[PDB]
């Protein structure tokens, strides 16, 4: 898909950030800050905004530029969340490049989160002249609910669980995942798209596709979690960082009372032994039947969308995310 000239609007997006910086060295700093954190990447979430904006809306106005801007606002929102995540999680690299807090220091990274946010806020606020109040208003409500949940989701990510009390530690996983990841990644860009378009209207037909974004997000984080276990070797990984994650969630689900003991002990000092078990528990295997069932259930759900115009972009959506996750390091 393209998505071109969504990417190419970056140029025009930079100029709008540049002209907002009439306050009146710092411009150069923050222009580079957005180049480092917003320019880099696949831009999946800003891409979800254009897709949904696509069949849903009918060619009338030059809101298209405005839709692209908002597609870059979502990218700055994603970026600022990740610069904040890499600090807490002692991240080393992201998007093939050292984390912003490493190149620029922690104090500047914290302040820079504040920059992107207010930038985000300001570019939104100035979409009133294009879609008017109602649209902007409905867009700002989505924004608030999205990040609010991500923060609480992130809080749960920081809040240590009770490994011994693993009766519904899985219930704590998915809930957390819905909070921290699922919302901003999927709910936010889509609902931002649904608004700009003003699709007409299937409101009662909104929970279904809501259940779609909940699984898309679950699926996204679940695979994120396995990759770390599968390819990260360090003392600043999920296990060495004592984090509630899909492999540990499942392990406690599949393991005898003798292996869950070996994991509770070494979590998390020796990540070595924790993974040893994951292999004898064949977690990797279990994620594959997940990945498998994840796909078709989304198709099940997709096949039920009534609009038949909303189902088109949601057909691309399911594809785009699954291709992201299955066309990885395969071997």
Annotated binding site for Mg(2+): 85, 89, 157, 224-225, 228, 238
Closer Cβ to Mg ion, 75 or 237, answer by number: 237
Number of residues that bind ligand RIS (CB under 6 A): 10
Q: Is residue 236 within 8 Å of 92, Cβ to Cβ?
A: yes
Per CB under 6 A, contacts with ligand RIS among 146-165 are 154
211 touches a second copy by CB under 8 A: no
The secondary structure element, H or E, covering residue 129 is: helix 128-158
Closer Cβ to ligand RIS, 126 or 145, answer by number: 145
Q: Residues 108-127: x/- map of binding to a second copy (CB under 8 A)?
A: x-xxxxxx-xxx-xx--x--
Q: How far apart are CB 83 and Mg ion at their closest, in Å?
A: 11
Q: Which residues bind Mg ion (CB under 5 A)?
A: 85, 89, 157, 224, 228
Which residue ranges are tagged as binding site? 85, 89, 157, 224-225, 228, 238
Contacts 24+ apart (CB under 8 A), 38-44: 38/72, 38/75, 38/76, 38/79, 38/116, 39/10, 40/95, 40/96, 40/97, 41/75, 41/95, 42/324, 43/6, 43/7, 43/75, 44/320, 44/321, 44/324
Q: Is residue 244 within 8 Å of 171, Cβ to Cβ?
A: no
What's 186's DSSP letter?
I
88 touches a second copy by CB under 8 A: yes
Closer Cβ to a second copy, 23 or 329, answer by number: 23
181 binding partner (options a second copy, ligand RIS, Mg ion, none; Cβ < 5 to 8 Å by kind) = ligand RIS
Helix, strand, coil percent content, the chain, rounded in steps of 5 = 70, 0, 25
From 20, 40, 65, 85, residue interacting with ligand RIS (rule: CB under 6 A): 85
What angle (nearest 5°) sits at the alpha carbon of residue 18, between those of residues 13 and 23?
Answer: 140
Structure-token match 């996750």, residue found: 325
Q: Under 8 Å CB-to-CB from 226, ≥6 apart: which residues?
A: 246, 247, 283, 284, 287
Interacting residues with ligand RIS (CB under 6 A): 81, 85, 89, 91, 154, 180-181, 221, 224, 228
Interacting residues with a second copy (CB under 8 A): 23-24, 26, 29-30, 84, 87-89, 105-108, 110-115, 117-119, 121-122, 125, 128, 133, 137, 140-141, 143-145, 147-149, 151-152, 154-156, 158-159, 168, 171-172, 175, 179
């Amino acid at each position: 898909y393209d998505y071109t000239d969504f990417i190419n609007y970056y140029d025009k997006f930079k100029v709008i950030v540049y002209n907002v910086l009439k306050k009146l060295p710092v411009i150069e700093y923050y222009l580079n800050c957005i180049d480092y954190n917003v320019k880099k990447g696949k831009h999946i979430r800003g891409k979800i905004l254009v897709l949904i904006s696509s069949l849903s809306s009918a060619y009338s106005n030059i809101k298209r530029d405005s839709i692209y801007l908002l597609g870059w606002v979502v990218e700055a929102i994603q970026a600022l969340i990740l610069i904040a995540d890499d600090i807490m999680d002692s991240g080393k690299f992201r998007r093939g490049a050292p984390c912003w807090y490493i190149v620029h220091g922690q104090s500047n990274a914290i302040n820079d989160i504040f920059f992107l946010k207010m930038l985000s806020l300001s570019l939104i606020f100035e979409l009133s002249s294009v879609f008017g109040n109602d649209i902007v208003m409905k867009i700002q409500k989505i924004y608030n609910e999205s990040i609010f949940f991500t923060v609480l989701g992130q809080h749960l990510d920081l809040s240590y669980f009770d490994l011994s009390k693993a009766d519904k530690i899985s219930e704590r996983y998915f809930s957390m995942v819905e909070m921290k990841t699922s919302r901003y990644t999927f709910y936010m860009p889509v609902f931002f798209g649904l608004t700009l378009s003003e699709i007409q209207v299937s409101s009662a037909q909104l929970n279904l596709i809501e259940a779609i974004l909940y699984k898309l997000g679950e699926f996204y984080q679940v695979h994120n979690d396995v990759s770390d276990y599968l390819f990260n070797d360090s003392n600043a990984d999920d296990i060495c960082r004592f984090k509630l994650t899909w492999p540990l969630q499942k392990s406690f689900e599949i393991a005898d009372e003798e292996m869950k003991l070996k994991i509770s002990e070494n979590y998390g000092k020796n990540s070595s032994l924790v993974k040893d078990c994951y292999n004898l528990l064949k977690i990797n295997e279990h994620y594959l039947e997940y990945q498998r069932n994840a796909l078709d259930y989304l198709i099940k759900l997709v096949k039920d969308i009534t609009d038949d115009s909303l189902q088109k972009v949601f057909i691309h959506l399911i594809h785009q995310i699954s291709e992201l996750i299955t066309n990885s390091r395969s071997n």
